[PDB]
Scaffold this active site. Structure first.
Site, PDB file in Angstrom:
ATOM      1  N   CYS B  64       6.548   8.219  -0.909  1.00  0.00           N
ATOM      2  CA  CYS B  64       5.948   7.045  -0.327  1.00  0.00           C
ATOM      3  C   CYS B  64       5.555   7.277   1.124  1.00  0.00           C
ATOM      4  CB  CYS B  64       6.940   5.874  -0.375  1.00  0.00           C
ATOM      5  SG  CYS B  64       7.433   5.403  -2.047  1.00  0.00           S
ATOM      6  N   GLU B 113       4.254  -4.696   2.259  1.00  0.00           N
ATOM      7  CA  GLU B 113       3.166  -3.737   2.193  1.00  0.00           C
ATOM      8  C   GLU B 113       2.197  -4.002   1.043  1.00  0.00           C
ATOM      9  OE1 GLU B 113       6.055   0.144   1.592  1.00  0.00           O
ATOM     10  OE2 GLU B 113       5.205  -0.147   3.605  1.00  0.00           O
TER      11      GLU B 113
HETATM   12  C1  LIG Z   1       6.438   1.144  -0.274  1.00  0.00           C
HETATM   13  C2  LIG Z   1       6.817   1.489   1.182  1.00  0.00           C
HETATM   14  C3  LIG Z   1       8.356   1.623   1.257  1.00  0.00           C
HETATM   15  O1  LIG Z   1       8.919   1.008   0.094  1.00  0.00           O
HETATM   16  C4  LIG Z   1       6.210   2.868   1.558  1.00  0.00           C
HETATM   17  C5  LIG Z   1       6.988   3.412   2.770  1.00  0.00           C
HETATM   18  O2  LIG Z   1       7.183   4.832   2.697  1.00  0.00           O
HETATM   19  P1  LIG Z   1       8.238   5.322   3.679  1.00  0.00           P
HETATM   20  O3  LIG Z   1       8.554   6.720   3.224  1.00  0.00           O
HETATM   21  O4  LIG Z   1       9.325   4.527   3.714  1.00  0.00           O
HETATM   22  O5  LIG Z   1       7.530   5.523   5.027  1.00  0.00           O
HETATM   23  P2  LIG Z   1       7.338   6.863   5.743  1.00  0.00           P
HETATM   24  O6  LIG Z   1       7.160   7.951   4.719  1.00  0.00           O
HETATM   25  O7  LIG Z   1       6.016   6.826   6.475  1.00  0.00           O
HETATM   26  O8  LIG Z   1       8.351   7.200   6.553  1.00  0.00           O
HETATM   27 MG   LIG Z   2       8.079   8.649   2.921  1.00  0.00          MG
HETATM   28 MN   LIG Z   3       5.885   0.334   5.856  1.00  0.00          MN
END
Ligand SMILES: C[C@@H](CO)CCOP(=O)(O)OP(=O)(O)O
Ligand SMILES: [Mg+2]
Ligand SMILES: [Mn+2]
Ligand SMILES: C[C@H](CO)CCOP(=O)(O)OP(=O)(O)O
Ligand SMILES: [Mg+2]
Ligand SMILES: [Mn+2]
Lengths: 176, 180
Positions: B64, B113
């Site tokens: 993610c 989000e």
């Molecule tokens: C769906 C959202 C979190 O549930 C996406 C966030 O991804 P994260 O991995 O939490 O954020 P990042 O990778 O940018 O640190």
């Molecule tokens: Mg991430």
């Molecule tokens: Mn976020």
């Protein structure tokens, strides 16, 4: 607070401070594992606080601990139930008396334990100690077992070992 | 690093530094979620690092993230796969473009989000990034879907929600085919 070092046989040979005892090289010692059910027969599953040294943030059976010198297994259980969960319980009953294991957590912290397993029923509401538990769930044993059978990696390694012990599973399945 | 702020509809209105954006009162922003399968069709499940501000130590799907300014969501997917898992992938497929989610984590941090979901195949070995991922497993999708059904509270809420979307789920299934 300490843990009790055990020789090849389960003979106590000395102690170590509890924090200092769990390292990448943890030596064999004494512990317990306990599964708690409420009056309705639901299993308490808990998630370890992020501050725990071993398996922080991991989903596990209800309460686990380290008996102290001179302390019975059953008293240790009662103690940690009170301490971690502020809960009173019925007399802990044996479900897997010869359980023993060694495992390594994602940061390389090891547990290496002679770890008799118990079960009990709660007799009061929980009062959570957030230095020990960060989350928890009252659920049906049957679902928990399915989860454990399908995705064992989602749970602590000793929880999985206990639940898939044929005898211990039968005995837990009688608490609901 | 930043997030792209979205208004009451998914229309962009500016940007906001990543860390500062994720609080107890997170404003709507753009993100993605991706589900990665190896050649054999196994799904890669990962566990967030204990240093993640939100849902640290939680088991979730592959990867993610947050697209940056001037970045396609697909580019973002490719970038985080490299950064988090060191892995090369096939072109990500959109499997749930309208997914949207708001939720509070065990300590009070909020994610809010617009999070299109993708699926892709890995084409290189993993080089796990410990500052992002503390553990992982290659699994058969069926099993994962059975664990999510039996104990959904043991995984990230967004993994459960995406997995139980009918259309999304059939895309995941398609990726379980063995592919050389
Ligand atoms: C769906 C959202 C979190 O549930 C996406 C966030 O991804 P994260 O991995 O939490 O954020 P990042 O990778 O940018 O640190
Ligand atoms: Mg991430
Ligand atoms: Mn976020
Ligand atoms: C983990 C072994 C067997 O599972 C028992 C120790 O459980 P801990 O919860 O780590 O014990 P403590 O509460 O004393 O930290
Ligand atoms: Mg404990
Ligand atoms: Mn120990």
């Amino acid at each position: 607070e300490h843990v009790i070092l055990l020789n090849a046989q389960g003979v106590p040979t000395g102690t170590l401070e509890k924090y200092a005892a769990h390292t990448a090289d943890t030596r064999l010692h004494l512990a317990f594992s306990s599964w708690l059910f409420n009056a309705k027969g639901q299993l308490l599953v808990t998630r370890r606080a992020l501050s725990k040294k071993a398996w922080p943030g991991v989903w596990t059976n209800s309460v686990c601990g380290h008996p102290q010198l001179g302390e019975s297994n059953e008293d240790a259980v009662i103690r940690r139930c009170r301490y971690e969960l502020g809960v009173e319980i019925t007399p802990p009953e044996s479900i897997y008396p010869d359980f023993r294991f060694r495992a390594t957590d994602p940061s390389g912290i090891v547990e290496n334990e002679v770890c008799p397993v118990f079960a009990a029923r709660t007799t009061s509401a929980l009062q959570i100690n957030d230095d020990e538990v960060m989350d928890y769930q009252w659920c049906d044993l049957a679902d928990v077992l399915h989860g454990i059978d399908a995705t064992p990696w989602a749970f602590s390694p000793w929880m999985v070992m206990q639940a898939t012990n044929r005898e211990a599973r039968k005995r837990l399945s009688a608490f609901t």
